[PDB]
Swiss-Prot record, chains A, B:
Keywords: Acetylation, Cytokine, Cytoplasm, Gluconeogenesis, Glycolysis, Hydroxylation, Isomerase, Phosphoprotein, Secreted, Ubl conjugation. It catalyses: alpha-D-glucose 6-phosphate = beta-D-fructose 6-phosphate. This is Glucose-6-phosphate isomerase. The modification N6-acetyllysine is found at residues 11, 141, 453. It comes from Oryctolagus cuniculus. The modification N6-(2-hydroxyisobutyryl)lysine is found at residue 33.
Length: 557, 557
């Protein structure tokens, strides 16, 4: 395993064993008035500023140096170029990894298998735009000649969560667009409850599946199609209400979709990195293609920042190494993502997939079994909702939890002359200040005394009122949450995931872990029909199946 | 710190040290065909069955005995009676913990400070029912004589999540009820994107707040009022469109709400255990009082189960000790909740609050600082959604992650002759089968060889195809997700949480962790006013503040 054998890594772990515990944020800030200046990064995109304040982290100049050294010695710069240049770094599948090509606004040639991929990227985008124009303007008409009012994306994983998170994040930019709906669960209630709110004559479905045989997606697509046909009787109308983001033209034709409404993407486009491709169609439809282009440009901006910036000043890499520090040295299992922004309520869920499906790995690019930790469990809820659910554990539990706090300076809803947003900002700043400052015994004792508590009352309360602090955070503040900024932000985290992967020597771009579950589920499916008991598995699987058969018959109240 | 002093605890740890790594799920099942029979539990509620199958846990009859011995030596049973008897077990706040009184259908007296609380519980319930009748039937009217179509719940933490989660879960039981909406974030987009969807004439607001001075709630309540008065205009109209869940009669009247529509609850009702009280007004409004009464009955049934069942077969206890095993011996930081049910999409989020805010503690009932792990990090998304997001890390990452898998046998939407649910069940059973069974190097090799891979190609891919398995899960299956079953399930986890807290000797029922953040936010609020640079905090807090002040006036192009 490369990491463990890397001398810079070893130096890093030895230092932590020796000095890690003695680091205390409060002392560090009390002793060094330049801390913010030393550990902060200001990015002017020319379309708004993004401030990355990583100063409330358990680091010193010495630690940052050791980390930057490790990134250098782990080759992140060369691995980065390999990615951007089209080399097949997805080693286990022998594929390129070029989500950066999807948003490549410079159109600089990126060649794979002898051909510049750019023209294909652009043909698809041009195609998406033309269609998006037809639909939004009311040009495109349903089978009864009515304009489209609802766009329904059907897909799983990356064919879903991205468009869904982005459209929710960019709501304010959706004037003139039709409503978007997202179906993903195979669970029939997901499609039932969506279908119940629709009019077939004005609904347009998008089936998002590269192979067009994804089971849950195609099953959902077929239910939608039978629902449509109940009204339209006529199968030739399907072409008016169902389009496809896919590569499987035969299967697409078979379903009833006009193959001119098949929007292609490529194998170098991982699902958890697909929103910038044809997979983004529902985003473009909801907020228009200008905004979709701003989203891509935002991503492109961050891509250039990742590429041209010295490591010391590289947002994505600084983010990654801080994570390595907490994962491979402090041993923290999780990474919290807390955007103080309701529109961004699925931001954390989205990266739960991006990070976890990319870096939840245990085999290195050499075939070696990892002997160090890899990807963290990512999780979160937007502030201040989360603040009211679980921060108690963050402030006073027994776990170290690195948190990323995010917020826009300008809100899309400056209601009450800025009141809600002021309170929101104050909490965003106070929470991180709290996590790092804490409240000592003496500090709490004073408050108890001043509040009128008795000595007995004081004695019992005291310990519970102490905050140990020393809980590290990142603050990421940006001028406003526009399509462009959102683009840069998503890409920033994408590149953070890339770097950690490189440092760990794993392949962030495959996902072999899904195979076992699918094959086992195929075996079970037919065993579920019928009354007789199943005895072919382990006793649990067997017992569970038999309990389902017994109770499926039950009439309950 | 007594858990650590406890001899049963010590023996458990010493045993795990010597034998824990030896446990192999696949081997246990292979060597004991009764495993399922021996490590599972069936519960007939008279309103649906609940199968708790904990056989896929790293545990033997010896380990369980040790875990129960521990629950015994830690006084689980007595603490339990203490809660049920109305004793002040919330020791820091000197209060009773009586959410079980709220659902006490037997009406057995529970006396606090010399008086049965039941009559007060039932008075409020009766009152909840009457108003609910008045609203659903159309009797209750708005300032223009229209009946109510939308009910808007406004609150934070427990005044919001429970009601949001339960109404999402029980949607099919809402025929005849008004649409419910939930507003919690202080961030302005929340209330604003909600208000934009309403008609003031037929909208009823419910401001949920014990003290009625909860800053973010009240701020939202005022924005709502002010928005209602922009059309209704007469302040006396507020009383027909706002009711309150509170005890602060004065603050309620001062807001314009009629004190006769102030539904009360008590000190002994924790926010994270409040949905069963007046706090569930919106639940009752949405699904009717009958269903709401079914919900409390389900929880009462589980309460009785917890109270009368010997530890060995006590579901919540079993759940509690199992978690102790993973938390205190295996060192697992997190616990996943994965409902294969889209209606339950907010179930995990609910328990993230109910668990982490109860048990994220570090000071024990005696004042000592713990020296062992405490509450886990709770997270999740419903399957198969989550399956397609992060299961990669669970199957092949570097972290042990206890998962609870839950599913109703019978679905609320049996479309396509049951095809969707069939697939859902198959994935539900297959995933746990997979986490347990894994796929070995040899098995993976035969596959690759069978797929015609060259020796070089096989070699490079082989280890990536290996599933190590041995990943423990609980499988909780229940006949159907009805209001009753749901209530049972909620109470089940409530008691799991209670049992863990007792073992940790912490106070699951206070929440002192919120103060610092609250204190520090109020300091910052006024400082945000203006263009003067702030200098009064550590350099990061100042830096952030100044950047915010600097960018609030940035025109963005």
């Amino acid at each position: 395993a490369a990491l463990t054998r890397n001398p810079q890594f070893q130096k890093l772990q030895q230092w932590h064993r020796e000095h890690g515990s003695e680091l205390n944020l409060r002392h560090l800030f009390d002793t060094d008035k330049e801390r913010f200046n030393h550990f902060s990064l200001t990015l002017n995109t020319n379309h708004g500023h993004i401030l990355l304040d990583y100063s409330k982290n358990l680091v010193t100049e010495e630690v940052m140096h050791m980390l930057l050294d490790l990134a250098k010695s782990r080759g992140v710069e060369a691995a980065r170029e390999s990615m951007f240049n089209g080399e097949k770094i997805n080693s286990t599948e022998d594929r390129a990894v070029l989500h950066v090509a999807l948003r490549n606004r410079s159109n600089t040639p990126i060649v794979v298998d002898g051909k510049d991929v750019m023209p294909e990227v652009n043909k698809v985008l041009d195609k998406m735009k033309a269609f998006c124009q037809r639909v939004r303007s009311g040009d495109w008409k349903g089978y009864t000649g009515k304009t489209i009012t609802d766009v329904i994306n059907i897909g799983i994983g990356g064919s879903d969560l991205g468009p869904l998170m982005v459209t929710e994040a960019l709501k304010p930019y959706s004037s003139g667009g039709p409503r978007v709906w997202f179906v993903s669960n195979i669970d029939g209630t997901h499609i039932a409850k969506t279908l119940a709110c629709l009019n077939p004559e004005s609904s347009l479905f998008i089936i998002a599946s590269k192979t067009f045989t994804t089971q849950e997606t195609i099953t959902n697509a077929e239910t939608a199609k039978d629902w449509f046909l109940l009204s339209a009787k006529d199968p030739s109308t399907v072409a008016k209400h169902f389009v496809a983001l896919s590569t499987n033209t035969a299967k697409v034709k078979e379903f009833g979709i006009d193959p001119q409404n098949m929007f292609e993407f490529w194998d170098w486009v991982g699902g958890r990195y697909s929103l910038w491709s044809a997979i983004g169609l529902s985003i473009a439809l909801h907020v228009g293609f200008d905004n979709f282009e701003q989203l891509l440009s935002g991503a492109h901006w961050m891509d250039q920042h990742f590429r041209t910036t010295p490591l010391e000043k590289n947002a994505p890499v600084l983010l990654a190494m801080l994570g390595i520090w907490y994962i491979n040295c402090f041993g923290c299992e999780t990474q919290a993502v807390l955007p103080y922004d309701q529109y961004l309520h699925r931001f954390a869920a989205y990266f739960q997939q991006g990070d976890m499906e990319s870096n939840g790995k245990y085999i290195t690019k050499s075939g070696a079994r990892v002997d160090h930790q890899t990807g963290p469990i990512v999780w979160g809820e937007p502030g201040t909702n989360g603040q009211h659910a679980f921060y108690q554990l963050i402030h006073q539990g027994t776990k170290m939890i690195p948190c990323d706090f995010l917020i826009p300076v300008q809100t899309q809803h400056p209601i009450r002359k800025g009141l809600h947003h002021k309170i929101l900002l104050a909490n965003f700043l106070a929470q991180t200040e709290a996590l790092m400052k804490g409240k000592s015994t003496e500090e709490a004792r004073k408050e108890l005394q001043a509040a009128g508590k008795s000595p007995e009352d004081l004695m019992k309360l005291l310990p519970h009122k102490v905050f140990e602090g020393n809980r590290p955070t990142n603050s990421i503040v940006f001028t406003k949450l526009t399509p462009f900024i959102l683009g840069a932000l998503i890409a920033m985290y994408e590149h953070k995931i890339f770097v950690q992967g490189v440092v760990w020597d794993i392949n962030s771009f495959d996902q072999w872990g899904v195979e076992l579950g699918k094959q086992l589920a195929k075996k079970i499916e037919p065993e579920l029909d019928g009354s007789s008991p199943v005895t072919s598995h382990d006793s649990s699987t067997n017992g569970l199946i038999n309990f389902i058969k017994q109770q499926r018959e039950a009439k309950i109240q």
